Every structure is written in structure tokens, then in C-alpha cells.
Design a protein around this ligand. Structure first.
Ligand SMILES: [Mg+2]
Length: 692
């Protein structure tokens, strides 16, 4: 039991709901009276804080008794809340608090340059032990007041860099969409879009000019995730969360936006104090601490050696006494090859050419002297030093294209802090890859101050990853033959991606997934069928763990039961949610806990406040059976170990990822494909993270 474990106690944003606000009984009802096709049964029960039992029998459950728009209903049974499954009971208490006790209007009352910032509370109820807790989160939603088209400096390329961002169509800021695709500019469609919204809002033609301004004809025809209708970037606004922003952005802002987890806790406690439904004290929870799992690399004699961090992987570049580390595997496509390298320097930093040259040379000459007489490829950048401007990316692309390589090349981009314009560097990488040039950008200001070799080490880690080099592996082998990260973006040709990891934690495949057919969703049973039949991955007599930011539908459960017996494989699935309502009032990290069946995962150190990752519904399909597994120390350690299989050393908060590498990279590939990056089959098969 818990009396022998290394536990650290920490406060979370869970507050005990008072007795008077917990329903004693749940009540079963069915619609006895007639209902038409436009009835919308799900909305009807959801409004009255209920839940559907059977859609066909029009049966539901309410957290209260109704003594009689609402139609005539038939009472079936009453049941003590205590006899109800914890997951069902939590939602019924939420519905009771929402519908009967009006928690949403009371919460609004408590909380009542070109950025419009809005504040809101989000709530959920959790059953922990025999008690119900309200999860209380306070969020800040900011909106760019300047519209999407002018914001992106009227450039179709900059617009593509916004795929995966949240938007609102100006008149309705209550509907939040996600950019998933673009299209060529058309003056005919621009007229057609305007004419539709004039009709919907009963507008005069004058209204469009008044609302959106001087309309752009050569404007792109944007498209979105939820609605098949065409979008006009001039008519939309970017919407984001202040806590979803990167650390670098946060530094320039005032203290309130970079607040610590402890200080964020003090704000939550203030809302809890004014809320009559809950006790004021936050829930104290016991947390396990994850082990700092070692990594394996090869030594100069190609023998495995224990390493605890990648912070010393390329320390031998500067330090002559530092231990030389060699990769586990280099793909056959780039094995001991002289890669035609390009050195791209931003025009605005031309004065520091002497310091730039001496930095690129001292790094590559020390790398090449070791890359020679080993599997590692060499970088040959002789006479391929070129200047570029962010104002004309197309100009420098026309200069490179003139040289027909038709082979794998590299480009080291030396840039400067241009803020929003930093997306032009991402435009350069994307367009460079269309020409088969893998590239990495670095900010000169930061690299110039790197006297310890820290950034050089991180730059080389990222270059290795982009070249699909399996530098380091996990010291501990898992029961799983495969750990598969899955993201399902799309109603289009390619609807998703699976990033396949082996038992050692190395990328075996970056597998794009084609959607089944028009008018149907990309479900887990179909992904498995696709991997076996169209991707050529042997998935029989295997132990496979799937990682997804999503829940399994009821229809999938039986198909997954059949697939497990058909493959003679153990198929597991766990839900990993980066966007959740939990908050841990601490600056500590490498910690995990379980709150009413949910795993609360806090892996990485952060400069400012950090949000935990929620782990939910760990399922097992084996021998035609379905089994719900309890989130434990074993999986959390495995998930933590997977946040360490990072080659994105130059990005994010520190060395390790917030979310495990298989799911993290699946999401990054889906975004990259949305921004119209090229799909290079050979490279993805070899695990090249060229899109990072
Ligand atoms: Mg209170």
C-alpha cells in the first residue's frame, strides 16, 4: 500500500462540493409523448443536466425528480447516486450544479495593444474516494483585433503557417474554428461568400464594406475543419489562450501572463471563496516522482553506454577530453555520405559575417573530423554560403532551384528575432524541402552568446532528428512491440498520421493515414486495418499501445474486440489530453498522480507556469475481450520516458517534451501537412523528422 511509497504532497484545483449540492438520487425517464425529427434529444437532456441511456427508447437519467421546451415524460426508476458508476455520477452532479443550481451565471458574476483579452471559468466534477470535487479553472482568451488577412501581411504563404490555430468569423466570436487547409485566390468566390452572409444577416451591401473594409480580390480562399463552406481570411480573427503561448512570447509580456502555478492557485482559491457550492480549501494530493531513465548511445568502439541527459551528446565538439558518443543507427539513404550543405545568412545580420563563419566552421569541422571514419554523414557547404531576405523568400528559392540536385541536401539558416515575421523562416524551411533540402534555422543573437556549447549541442540534436538518425535509445525495454502515436485531423485524402515507435523508443515509421471513404470518420479499427493492409506493418502476434488525444466511440469497442482476436494481438489504448481543466499548484516537475481514475502528469520543467497532462481510459483488447485498466506507476513512467525521446532540443520548454514523442510528432506531421509540406514516402519510412 501507499504507506511505503516516495510521495510528495501538492495542491490541485479540486474543491469539495458541499452536501446540499450533491443529489441523493438519480431518476430514469423516457419520452412518453410524441417527438418530431427536429427534436434534438441530446440537446434536450444536456440542457436539463441529464444523460441519454438509449436513443431508440428515448430513455435518459436526470440528477433530480421532475414534477412536470419540456414535453410529457414517463418515470421509470429512482436510484441512489452511490449505486451509479463514478464516471456517470460525476456528469450527473455537474448537470445538477449547472441546470438546478445555475453554477455558470454565478461563476461569471464572481469574475466580472491590438489584443482583446477575455476571462472565463471552466468547470468539471470528479469523484475521488466517496466525495465529489469541482475542478475549477480560470482561463484567458485573447483575440487579434486586426483581421487574419492583414495580420498575415497579405501573404498566402504566411497564412499557411496559421494552420492549426484557432479562429472566429468576425460577427460571431462565440464559434471557435481551426484552420486545416487553404486554396488559390479567386475573385469570383470572394463575391459569392459576401453575397451569402448579406442574405443570412439580412444586411444591405453597404454593411460588408462597413464591417470588413476595402475587400481584397486577389485574397486566398481559405477552408476550415468543421464546415465545408469557403472562408475569406479578411473576415476572420485569430483566437488563442494566454497559457497556450510559448515561453519566449511570455517574457516580453507583464507578470500577470507569466504567473507561477502557486500564484495561479491563489487566484483559483479567490473564486472558490466566493463560490457557495464548494469548500474553499484546494484538494491536497500525493504525487509519485518519476525516475530519470537513462539513455543508451554508442561509444568510440560502438559499444552501448549509459547517458542520463542529451546535454552532453555533442560536448566533444568543443571539449577535447569530453567522451565521444556515436549513433545507434543512421538510415542507408544518408549512411557515410557527403551531404551538399547550404549556409543561409539573413541579409539584416551581414555585419557579423566574421563571427557567423567562425561559428559554422568550428562546429562543422569538429563534427566532420569524427563523421569521417563512421556511419554519420558529413556536411559539405563549400561555396554554398548565400544571403537572403524574409521580404523575398521566393527570390532565394529561385536561386537554389537553378541547381538540380535530386538528392538529400542540408541547409543551415542563420536568422534574427523578427517576432511574427519569424514565420518567414518556417516558410523558407518548407519551400526548401520541396527542393529536397532538409533545413534548420537558428537565431544568431542566441548562438553568439553560447560560450558553453549548449545551443551547438541542441542544434546538432535537432539536425540528427531531421536526418532520421537514431542517435540515442531507451535503456529500459518495454512489453510493447510498438507504441503508436495517433492524430486524426480529417473529409479529405489524408486524414491522419501514426508515428510508430519500437520497444527501444526509436521511430520506425511516420505513417500518413488516408481517410476510409467520403462521408465517414477515421476510427481506430480502420487505422489498424490500414497499417496491416496498406502500410505493410506486421501487426499480428504483437503487443501494441496506441496513444491518442481522443476517446473511443462505443461502435469501435466491438470492432477492436474482433481485431484483437483476428490479429492474435494485445491492443491497448490510452487517452492523452494536453488540453484539460486540471492545475497543480507547484513549480515542481517529473511528478504524477491519480485523481478519480484520471492520471495527472506533470513531466517537464517550465520557466513560467505549466499545465498538467490528463491521462484517461486505458483500455485493453485481448482475445476478443475488452478490459479497463487502472492508470498506474508503470504507464506513467513509460509515458514520462517517451517525453525524453526528443530531437526538438531547440524548441519548447527545456530538454524534454510536455507530451510523449509518438503523439507529439504525429500532431506535428498533421500540422505540417495542413501547411502544405511535401509528403516524402522514403524519408517518412526511415523516420526523418524533416517537418519539425
Ligand atoms: Mg467556497
Amino acid at each position: 500500500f501507499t504507506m511505503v511509497l516516495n510521495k510528495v504532497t501538492y495542491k490541485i484545483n479540486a474543491y469539495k462540493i458541499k452536501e446540499e449540492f450533491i443529489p441523493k438520487e438519480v431518476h430514469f425517464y423516457r419520452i412518453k409523448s410524441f417527438v418530431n425529427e427536429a427534436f434534438n434529444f441530446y440537446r434536450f437532456v444536456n440542457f436539463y443536466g441529464g444523460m441519454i441511456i438509449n436513443k431508440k427508447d428515448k430513455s435518459f437519467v436526470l440528477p433530480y425528480k421532475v414534477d412536470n421546451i419540456p414535453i410529457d415524460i414517463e418515470y421509470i426508476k429512482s436510484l441512489k447516486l452511490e449505486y451509479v458508476k463514478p464516471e456517470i455520477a460525476e456528469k450527473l452532479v455537474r448537470g445538477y450544479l449547472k441546470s438546478v443550481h445555475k453554477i455558470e451565471p454565478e461563476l461569471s458574476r464572481i469574475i466580472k495593444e491590438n489584443i482583446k483579452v477575455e476571462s472565463y471559468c471552466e468547470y468539471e466534477v470528479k469523484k475521488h474516494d466517496g466525495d465529489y470535487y469541482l475542478i475549477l479553472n480560470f482561463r484567458h482568451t485573447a483575440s487579434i483585433t486586426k483581421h487574419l488577412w492583414d495580420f498575415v501581411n497579405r501573404d498566402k504563404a504566411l497564412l499557411e503557417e496559421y494552420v492549426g490555430k484557432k479562429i472566429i468569423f468576425k460577427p460571431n466570436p462565440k464559434v471557435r474554428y481551426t484552420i486545416s487547409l487553404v486554396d488559390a485566390p479567386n475573385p469570383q468566390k470572394i463575391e459569392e461568400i459576401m453575397s451569402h452572409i448579406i442574405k443570412y444577416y439580412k444586411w444591405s451591401e453597404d454593411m460588408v464594406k462597413s464591417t470588413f473594409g476595402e475587400i481584397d480580390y486577389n485574397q486566398p480562399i481559405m477552408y476550415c475543419e468543421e464546415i465545408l463552406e469557403p472562408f475569406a481570411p479578411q473576415f476572420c480573427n485569430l483566437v488563442f489562450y494566454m497559457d497556450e503561448l510559448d515561453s519566449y512570447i511570455l517574457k516580453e509580456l507583464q507578470s500577470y501572463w507569466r504567473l507561477s502555478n502557486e500564484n495561479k492557485g491563489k487566484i483559483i482559491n479567490e473564486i472558490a471563496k466566493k463560490l457557495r457550492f464548494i469548500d474553499n480549501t484546494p484538494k491536497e494530493l500525493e504525487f509519485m516522482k518519476f525516475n530519470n531513465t537513462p539513455l543508451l548511445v554508442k561509444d568510440v568502439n560502438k559499444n552501448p553506454t549509459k547517458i542520463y541527459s542529451t546535454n552532453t551528446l555533442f560536448t566533444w565538439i568543443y571539449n577535447q577530453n569530453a567522451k565521444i558518443y556515436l549513433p545507434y543507427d543512421v538510415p542507408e539513404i544518408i549512411r557515410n555520405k557527403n551531404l551538399l550543405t547550404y549556409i543561409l545568412i539573413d541579409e539584416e545580420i551581414k555585419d557579423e559575417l566574421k563571427a557567423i563563419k567562425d561559428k559554422v566552421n568550428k562546429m562543422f569541422r569538429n563534427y566532420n573530423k569524427i563523421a569521417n571514419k563512421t556511419e554519420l554523414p558529413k556536411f559539405n557547404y563549400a561555396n554554398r554560403w548565400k544571403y537572403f531576405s524574409t521580404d523575398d523568400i521566393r527570390g532565394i528559392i529561385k536561386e537554389i532551384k537553378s541547381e538540380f540536385n535530386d538528392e538529400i541536401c542540408f541547409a543551415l539558416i542563420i536568422g534574427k528575432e523578427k517576432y511574427k515575421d519569424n514565420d518567414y523562416y518556417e516558410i523558407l524551411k518548407k519551400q526548401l524541402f520541396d527542393l529536397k533540402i532538409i533545413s534548420q534555422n537558428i537565431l544568431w543573437e542566441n548562438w553568439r552568446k553560447d560560450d558553453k556549447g549548449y545551443m551547438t549541442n541542441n542544434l546538432l540534436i535537432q539536425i540528427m532528428g531531421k536526418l532520421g538518425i537514431k542517435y540515442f535509445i531507451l535503456d529500459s525495454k518495454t512489453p510493447y512491440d510498438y507504441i503508436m502515436g495517433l492524430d486524426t485531423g480529417l473529409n479529405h485524402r489524408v486524414g491522419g498520421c501514426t508515428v510508430v515507435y519500437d520497444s527501444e523508443g526509436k521511430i520506425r515509421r511516420i505513417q500518413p493515414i488516408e481517410t476510409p471513404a467520403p462521408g465517414e470518420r477515421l476510427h481506430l479499427p480502420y487505422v489498424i486495418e490500414y497499417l496491416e493492409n496498406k502500410a505493410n506493418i506486421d501487426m499480428e502476434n504483437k503487443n501494441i499501445l496506441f496513444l491518442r488525444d481522443g476517446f473511443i466511440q462505443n461502435s469501435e469497442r466491438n470492432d477492436l474486440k474482433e481485431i484483437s482476436k483476428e490479429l492474435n494481438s494485445n491492443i491497448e489504448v490510452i487517452s492523452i489530453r494536453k488540453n484539460n481543466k486540471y492545475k497543480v499548484f507547484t513549480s515542481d516537475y517529473r511528478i504524477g498522480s491519480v485523481f478519480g481514475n484520471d492520471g495527472i502528469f506533470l513531466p517537464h520543467k517550465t520557466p513560467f507556469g505549466s499545465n498538467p497532462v490528463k491521462l484517461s481510459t486505458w483500455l485493453r483488447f485481448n482475445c476478443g475481450n475488452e478490459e479497463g485498466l487502472k492508470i498506474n506507476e508503470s504507464i506513467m513512467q513509460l509515458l514520462y520516458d517517451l517525453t525524453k525521446m526528443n530531437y526538438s532540443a531547440l524548441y519548447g520548454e527545456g530538454r524534454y517534451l510536455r507530451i510523449p514523442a509518438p503523439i507529439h510528432y504525429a500532431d506535428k506531421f498533421v500540422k505540417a501537412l495542413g501547411k502544405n509540406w511535401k509528403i516524402d514516402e522514403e524519408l517518412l519510412k526511415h523516420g526523418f523528422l524533416y517537418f519539425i
